Curated annotation (Swiss-Prot):
InterPro entries per the UniProt record, alphabetical: ISC_FeS_clus_asmbl_IscsX, IscX-like_sf
Quaternary structure, from the entry: Monomer.
Family membership noted in the UniProt record: Belongs to the IscX family.
PANTHER family per the UniProt record, alphabetical: PROTEIN ISCX
Cited function: May function as iron donor in the assembly of iron-sulfur clusters.
GO cellular component, one term: cytosol
Transmembrane segments: none
Organism name: Escherichia coli (strain K12)
GO molecular function: enzyme inhibitor activity; ferrous iron binding; iron ion binding
Descriptive protein name: Protein IscX
One example of a Gene Ontology biological process annotation: iron-sulfur cluster assembly
Length: 73
């Protein structure tokens, strides 16, 4: 998961690096390993830059984001 080059600030479920970085920046001391997909999904949908459909996520998408968060942490 590497950085994309969007011109807009809006993030899509596939922007794994950007979302993971956002979560890390917003919740600096929360251990990503302990986070449940059910909760993370909601936190991502509430991100200011989130610009996708909440229904469009899946476990592969969320695992990618969780792994980026773990890396940033």
């Amino acid at each position: 998961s590497h950085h994309h080059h969007h011109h807009g600030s809006g993030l899509k479920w596939t922007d794994s690096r950007e979302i993971g970085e956002a979560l890390y920046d917003a919740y600096p001391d929360l251990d990503p390993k302990t986070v449940r997909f059910t909760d993370m999904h909601q936190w991502i949908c509430d991100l200011e830059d989130f610009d996708d459909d909440p229904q469009a996520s899946n476990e592969k998408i969320l695992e990618a984001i969780l792994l980026v968060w773990l890396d940033e942490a």
